[PDB]
Amino acid sequence: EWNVEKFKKDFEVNISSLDAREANFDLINIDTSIANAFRRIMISEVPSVAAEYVYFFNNTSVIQDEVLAHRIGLVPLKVDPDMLTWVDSNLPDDEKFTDENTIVLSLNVKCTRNPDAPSTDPKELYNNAHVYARDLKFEPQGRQSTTFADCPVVPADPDILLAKLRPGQEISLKAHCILGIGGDHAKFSPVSTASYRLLPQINILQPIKGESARRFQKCFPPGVIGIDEGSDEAYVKDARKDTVSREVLRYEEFADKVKLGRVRNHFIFNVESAGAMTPEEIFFKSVRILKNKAEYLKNCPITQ
Amino acid sequence: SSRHGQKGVCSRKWPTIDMPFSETGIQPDIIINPHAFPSRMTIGMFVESLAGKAGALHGIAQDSTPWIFNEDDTPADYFGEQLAKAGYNYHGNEPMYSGATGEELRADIYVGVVYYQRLRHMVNDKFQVRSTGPVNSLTMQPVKGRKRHGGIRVGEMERDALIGHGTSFLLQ
Amino acid sequence: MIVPVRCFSCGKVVGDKWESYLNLLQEDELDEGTALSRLGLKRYCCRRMILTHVDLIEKFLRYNPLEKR
Amino acid sequence: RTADFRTLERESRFINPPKDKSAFPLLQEAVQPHIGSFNALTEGPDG
């Protein structure tokens, strides 16, 4: 029998490591359908900010215009979502981009030749030969010159090489950055990989002590199997460290004396980040999207 | 197409949301059906799949000149031995989960890194639709033409196919 | 051409690691396997994006119609 | 076998094309049936 109090008693969270970019943690005693939904929303439904429309005024570089617009869209901006609202893609362009929807970035690079003494490196040989993502300038349009003055818009990875130039060439563009979800386009996906794996279970059946444990050590990652004696002979130290390579199954000494299963309700989530949000915060933002995804159906009239 | 004569049309662009994911967290870029293998017998693609994954891990490149290997020096043993030293499966398989249901797939899936190629000829100038339009002046029949917005030809063999059904009004 | 901004499979930003990679090979004289692992690429899908890039933009830039010679 | 990709050697040759005879000499011996054949119309024995 199942309940919500019966789920609250058994559910556990064990947080392995937490960082500004990645976060490993466990979800114990939850179903695969729920944990796949958390993995799903983090890739596909948590919104983020990325450049959507690019307005080239001049581009005399080698890179095509539509190629260079594509590269700007893939640059992860460190804008916090919930500072922006959502655009409305039906009412036309004279009314659509407000200062509360949109963040304007600009790029204005010219390449000139550097007079140098010496087959030489082009940082010492041209001026502004490489264009990086840190050359994107935040232009605080409208009344949000004061709410983005606390922390302005910057790319989360400022050394992304966008274009390369030679003297005479220039790029002058202006990109509007809008809010969107990763199901629409992968540039809005706030996670570098939201994924899980299921906890490996290594069931030893017969005692395989002795030198038949020294070679049972080596069929697993190093921290996985331990040895003491014929007593506490060969046991699982950490069944979380194991990559399921099944290397012990191709030796005939152990094809009867071990199994490889999974612990089916114990998930090991590894959430990374593209940069805009910390990975513990887009797990909260995912578990609340699924909750509101059900409220909006509960609070909705059943039609016809 | 890969480098083995395994060409294939892109049938659907499938979202990462519900594509299968591995222990590493990787969704594959290309899915190829294993029913394209038993009648083609392109076994160079199976050994390229585990050679290429061994090279992406260790950062090395592999020679695939013919007749380097031997029947006593099988490359599934060579590049399999390199996957085992990295910590992957010897046979090239990976434990992989379902993107749609979230459950673990039944057998470990043969995943690897194969060099792919995009062919030049594409399907743009291939479709056309006509409700009515231009005619010919002699016959008052629909004009020919892909870009002249022209009709589709019901030829001689299709006239015989419409009599064979006994459909006198579809012929009419 | 230029280095891909993101990786095709994983989606890690990879475009900031091409000049770092060429200095780990040149200055530090690392092999390609150690150089990719110090850059923090460890999924083999994200490894092959830096490992196997050709960088033809350096060969296109020699044909400049806007400067003499 | 070991067969490396010459990643620093490629990028040096992209930025700095050679000022001597070309690298990749097997590539010019692939069209030696065409170039040498045309060259025998003006150069060689008996004019």
Binding site: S16, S17, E22, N24, S195, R197, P221, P222, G223, R240, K241, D242, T243, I268, N270 | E23, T24, G25, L57, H58, I60, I68, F69, N70, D73, P75, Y78, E81, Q82, K85, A86, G87, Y88 | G33, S37, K42 | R1, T2
Partner: peptide, 24 residues
């Protein structure tokens, strides 16, 4: 006949998620 050269110096380069080279 000389064998295909086994590349020397190959190490553990697939660690499980959240783990790194903690194996010493």
């Amino acid at each position: 006949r000389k064998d295909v050269p086994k590349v020397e110096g190959l190490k553990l380069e697939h660690f499980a998620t959240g783990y790194d080279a903690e194996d010493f």
